[PDB]
């Protein structure tokens, strides 16, 4: 015969959703140098990287972090005044034909009975002509705040961990196309490094595919899911702001010091980016060869620049040395494939509606001296044109905007599960 018996602490899990916690802010619990990766054996676990909730959680966490970083900073509400502007004409080239615009304006001082007369060099995209009088871009939509100069906010590794009764499962398989039964599985106490990078159309920095390029999509063929392309090898990219720029303090009240552009030292030129043309060519060749699997071995492919929309999505948008770079990637995604250094012009901004929100606009202070940013390009975010086209070249265009997808580029190997440690079974033991 057989009798029930209760086994406690039994290796059984089920998918579930709960809060996680970081490891590495002023509140992160420090990690440890023991990345204990117990290789689960003879296991095979279903994965769906498109619905692991924690990515959204991470997104939400980042949002809140950003907000709490900005709240104890000066609010430039008095700054919304009429601007007497003049187009700059000092050592200005034919590329940047009137982007910087030095604008005088009256500004409040410590004693609001008195005022002063100060200047600036706001970029064009932030100023709009109200009628020669201009206003800052945000002064009618949303309030304006400034980033505290202390924080040099940038990608800092933020490991993740599960809270004492939940497990984090990796997928060590190197051909994981994002969905299905992953054959090789291993748990970890905490996740590896994930740089919380903010980039659209081009996933700057991060983790590269171990063996070969990979194309991920919840459905490759429905022209409405942002395709992720993870590279096998990195692509070197160098972005530069070569205009020697200074910074000045202006007293906006009892202690509120607004950091404003004073004047550009020396010459002025366009702030541009460079990528090795040959390596980019080889990597895009690799990408199209991989795409031939999903779209057949006899399909023409076309690459065309972004199709339109907002400034943040129409262009490569990212952070570089405190400034916000908006590079026009029409100079790369222009090609066709049948069955040296590329140079990218880039614009700059000082008013950013980050996280595509409405009501919270952040002012990015300038940074003294020229700026350089060397980085590894690790993957792209593409979308298929469509048009059906009978059988014809299928066109791919850069996409992005929804930053969550970028988080999915590093949170696809992982999943969170809950342990059910109270099992039962039959055995020949009787009380």
């Amino acid at each position, epitope marked *: 015969n057989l009798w029930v018996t209760v086994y406690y602490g039994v290796p059984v899990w089920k998918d579930a959703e709960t809060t996680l916690f970081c490891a590495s802010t002023h509140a992160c619990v420090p990690t440890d140098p023991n990345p204990q990766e117990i290789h689960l054996e003879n296991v095979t676990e279903e994965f769906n990287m498109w619905k692991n909730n924690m990515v959204e959680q991470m997104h939400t966490d980042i949002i809140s972090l950003w907000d709490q970083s900005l709240k104890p900073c000066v609010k430039l509400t008095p700054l919304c005044v009429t601007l007497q502007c003049t187009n700059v004409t000092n050592n200005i080239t034919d590329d940047m034909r009137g982007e910087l615009k030095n604008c005088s304006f009256n500004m409040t001082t410590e004693l609001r009975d008195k005022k002063q007369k100060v200047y600036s060099l706001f970029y064009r995209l932030d100023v709009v002509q109200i009628n020669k009088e201009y206003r800052l871009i945000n002064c009618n939509t949303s309030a304006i705040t400034q980033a505290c100069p202390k924080v040099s906010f940038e990608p800092i590794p933020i490991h993740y961990c599960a809270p004492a009764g939940f497990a984090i499962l990796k997928c060590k398989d190197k051909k994981f196309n994002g969905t299905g039964p992953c054959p090789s599985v291993s748990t970890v106490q905490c996740t590896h490094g994930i740089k919380p990078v903010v980039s659209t159309q081009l996933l700057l920095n991060g983790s590269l595919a171990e063996e070969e390029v990979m194309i991920r999509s919840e459905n490759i063929t429905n022209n409405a899911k942002n395709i992720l392309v993870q590279f096998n090898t990195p692509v070197q990219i160098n972005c530069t702001r070569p205009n020697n720029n200074t910074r000045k303090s202006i007293r906006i009240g009892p202690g509120q010091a607004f950091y404003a552009t004073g004047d550009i030292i020396g010459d002025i030129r366009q702030a541009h980016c460079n990528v090795s043309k040959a390596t980019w060519n080889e990597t895009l060749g690799k990408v199209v060869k991989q795409l031939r699997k999903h779209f057949g071995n006899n399909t023409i492919i076309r690459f065309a620049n972004s199709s*339109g929309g907002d400034l943040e999505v129409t262009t490569h948008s990212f952070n570089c040395g405190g400034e916000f770079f908006y590079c026009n990637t029409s100079g790369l995604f222009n090609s066709t494939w049948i069955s040296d250094s590329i140079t990218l012009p880039c614009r700059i901004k000082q008013i950013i509606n980050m996280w*595509q929100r409405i009501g919270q606009a952040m002012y990015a202070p300038p940074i003294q001296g020229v700026i350089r940013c060397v980085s590894n390009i690790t993957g792209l975010i593409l979308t298929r044109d469509g048009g059906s086209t009978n059988s014809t070249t299928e066109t791919f265009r850069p996409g992005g*905007g929804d930053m969550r997808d970028n988080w999915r580029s590093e949170l696809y190997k992982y999943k969170v599960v809950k342990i059910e440690p109270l099992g039962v079974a039959p055995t020949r033991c009787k009380r």
Partner: antibody
Amino acid sequence: QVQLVQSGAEVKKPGASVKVSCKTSGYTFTDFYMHWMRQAPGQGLEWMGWINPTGGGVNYAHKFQGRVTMTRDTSISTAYMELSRLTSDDTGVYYCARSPARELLPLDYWGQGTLVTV
Amino acid sequence: IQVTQSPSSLSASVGDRVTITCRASQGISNYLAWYQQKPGKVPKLLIYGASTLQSGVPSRFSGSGSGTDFTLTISSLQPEDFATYYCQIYETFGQGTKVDIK
């Protein structure tokens, strides 16, 4: 309630540019993508394109690429479209439709409907 | 994605079983939707997500299938029910079909 008003009937001559509008009320504008559709008189309903009201992302189809351009306005909760370099075949009815998230099949609810005479 | 509606033309009477299908190229699982467009009025959605139906839809309207072939079927038919119907797949809308009394 959820209401999708659409622009009025417009009449025109070939070669110019024509603009249409679709105003929404009753739901979170940025949550649902917007498809634009067109049907020629007594014909099927060909898909003009789709737009994302979160960052302004848009995708057209080649059949109608390089001629169409659509944008969004989050303040009044509206979606605008324009067509340039028109051809006589383009005469017909245009529609605005609503799809959840980054999905394209369920075209729940619809606009009043615009007619364009090329 | 090739879409072939069937039948192109159809005449049916009040209260009868009427079925309409559309052939696809490859398999799309539940990914399918059917709509109606009464003449003059705006098109409205009948079925989505393969069998799944819309809210406020009478249960007489029901679709299902698999692979390349699916079918929307109706048993009861009140006079407003007949209209032009449209099968849809990806960016490959069906040509449509004509439903008339008797």
